[PDB]
Design a protein around this ligand. Structure first.
Ligand SMILES: CCCS(=O)(=O)Nc1cc(N)c(F)cc1F
Ligand SMILES: CCCS(=O)(=O)Nc1cc(N)c(F)cc1F
Ligand SMILES: CCCS(=O)(=O)Nc1cc(N)c(F)cc1F
Lengths: 300, 254
């Protein structure tokens, strides 16, 4: 079980670790998060108490190195940093644990929520979507734009999601205009799955990563990407049976986890109505349709 | 964006544009079967593609053979329209290609945008104008060429005959829309007004009669009264009580 120590907490902040969060007071003796499950990516995230537009965080995997958080009073944020001296790191963590100044990653033993939300998400794929190759962890925030959003400004600070555009030459074979527009099977299976993602696992990885960035940071372009990747499957007549069964599970846990009070901003009425009620796959997402109908029946 | 009353002069500027009307592409007669069920029988249709500045009409005849063994014909009709418009643009020299295509029905936007992905600089626009282009099949010579077709065919007309020798494209378009509005509201009456006088004929190479400038004023007045008379017959309104501001608005309103 791994540990992300903190140097200090000089400014009052809500700290998120995956789906959990807690309030830390200005100069409270907080020195970090222990008992973080090995085997999954994690996200530590922040919202300053004095400025709620400061909403940002770090994707990391404790198997890849020893990471800590230190507030930078110049740039005015909690920064992730890698400690390359193993023995120093272990000595620092040991002191903070002994003096019990760390919160415990509060995982219920029965609870597979985080696994279910991150099943296909890999740190190496995150680092291709978020380019900063000198760090093993990836910074995201509420305002970062997508490559697609920047086509329709700063290219170094963008989310490099796979561009999906239903009215593009990539999506439509010359001579198959009506066929390819009304049945997106070609675009899903040949262009995206076989061509770009190589397999459904990388496609689901990017879909789950887009959802999590939408939910944890309110990142608008991530929300667009999550819905585009859902609509591309639901609008395809020919999808492998395993992919549909897996999509239903993925979406079920995403809808389960979504805070009720953010449904109005994080869910697109047109996409969900089309996907559950009009699309080729309208009868293929049993679990997702039942939780959507019981939790968000106004949206539909 | 959307072509409306506000941006109406844009039709007669020097940027090449085409209107596309798909109303007459898929046409059926509904009839009873021997078993007392209902069946459709398709008849020949046409795409109405018009340069409102020049009067040039690209009438693509849609032969019933197009529909043989196809399903969802009302949806296919939009995609076949977009395919034929796309083929027409690709057939024109670059300097004759339109800069904009205005579709009379919003359902044509996606089919045409997808067929025109090769032409990113051609704007595909809807209109807020309720244009009476469905009444094209009330023009005897256009009806005649569509119904006689035995195969897919493109036929080229000038829907303004020689009017642009004497009037602007703005006025020519207004005359065309008034004639088509009248034909659409009361075809028999409209035809009676146009063809009553045996002395005024249609040249072999024209669609409409050879009216003098004064005779066109009388005709246009008779067409406006027909539209008013029918709006009176329709809504049970005394058209005597109507003012000139009341009259003007109900014709435009349409
Ligand atoms: C007390 C010394 C360590 S610290 O300055 O509080 N913060 C810190 C510093 C390093 N280098 C680390 F790997 C972990 C840490 F928590
Ligand atoms: C040789 C075209 C004759 S026409 O039908 O009278 N007028 C005309 C019609 C079309 N459609 C055109 F592109 C050019 C034209 F001059
Ligand atoms: C667009 C049809 C033009 S029109 O034949 O001139 N109709 C018309 C006729 C009159 N008298 C008017 F005041 C306004 C109009 F629009």
């Amino acid at each position: 079980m791994n540990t992300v120590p903190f140097t200090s907490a000089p400014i009052e902040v809500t700290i998120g670790i995956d789906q959990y969060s807690f309030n830390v007071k200005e100069n409270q003796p907080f020195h970090g998060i222990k008992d973080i499950p090995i085997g999954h990516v994690h996200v530590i995230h922040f919202q300053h108490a004095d400025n709620s537009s400061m909403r940002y965080g770090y994707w990391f995997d404790c198997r890849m190195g020893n990471f800590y958080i230190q507030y930078d009073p110049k740039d005015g944020l909690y920064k992730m940093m890698e400690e390359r001296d193993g023995a120093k790191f272990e000595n620092i963590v040991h002191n903070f644990k002994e003096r019990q100044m760390m919160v415990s990653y509060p995982k219920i033993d029965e609870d597979d929520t985080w696994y279910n939300l991150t099943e296909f998400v890999q740190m190496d794929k995150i680092r291709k979507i978020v380019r900063k190759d000198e760090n093993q962890f990836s910074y995201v925030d509420s305002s970062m734009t997508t490559v697609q959003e920047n086509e329709l400004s700063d290219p170094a600070h963008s989310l490099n999601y796979t561009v999906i555009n239903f009215k593009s030459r990539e999506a439509i074979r010359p001579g198959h205009e009506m066929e390819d527009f009304l049945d997106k099977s070609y675009y899903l299976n040949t262009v995206m799955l076989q061509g770009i993602f190589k397999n459904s696992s990388n496609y689901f990885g990017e879909l789950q990563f887009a959802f999590l960035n939408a939910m944890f940071f309110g990142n608008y372009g991530s929300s667009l990407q999550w819905h585009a990747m859902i609509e591309l499957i639901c609008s395809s007549a020919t999808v492998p049976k395993h992919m549909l069964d897996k999509l239903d599970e993925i979406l079920y846990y995403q809808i389960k986890t979504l805070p009720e009070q953010y449904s109005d901003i994080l869910l697109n009425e047109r996409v969900w109505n089309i996907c559950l009620y009009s699309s080729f796959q309208k009868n293929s997402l049993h679990n997702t349709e039942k939780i959507m109908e019981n939790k968000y029946p106004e949206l539909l | 964006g959307a072509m409306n009353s506000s941006n109406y002069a844009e039709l007669f500027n020097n940027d090449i544009k085409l209107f596309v009307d798909d109303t007459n592409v898929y046409r059926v007669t509904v009839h009873k079967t021997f078993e007392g069920n209902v069946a459709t029988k398709a008849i020949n249709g046409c795409i109405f593609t018009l340069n409102p500045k020049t009067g040039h009409l690209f009438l693509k005849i849609i032969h019933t053979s197009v529909w043989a063994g196809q399903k969802r014909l009302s949806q296919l009709a939009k995609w076949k329209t977009a395919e034929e418009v796309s083929a027409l643009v690709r057939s024109l020299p670059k300097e004759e290609q339109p800069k904009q295509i205005i579709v009379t029905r919003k359902a044509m936007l996606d089919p045409l945008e997808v067929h025109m992905l090769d032409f990113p600089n051609i704007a595909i626009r809807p209109t807020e104008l309720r244009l009476p282009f469905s009444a094209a099949m009330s023009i005897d010579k256009l009806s005649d060429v569509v119904m006689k077709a035995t195969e897919p065919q493109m036929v080229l007309f000038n829907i303004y005959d020689d009017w642009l020798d004497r009037i602007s494209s703005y006025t020519a378009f207004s005359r065309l829309t008034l004639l088509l509005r009248a034909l659409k509201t009361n075809e028999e009456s409209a035809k009676m007004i146009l063809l009553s006088d045996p002395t005024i004929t249609i040249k072999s190479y024209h669609l409409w009669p050879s009216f003098t400038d004064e005779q066109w004023i009388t005709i246009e007045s008779q067409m406006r009264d027909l539209i008013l008379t029918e709006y009176g017959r329709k809504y049970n309104v005394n058209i005597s009580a109507l003012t000139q501001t009341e009259i003007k608005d109900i014709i435009l309103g349409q």
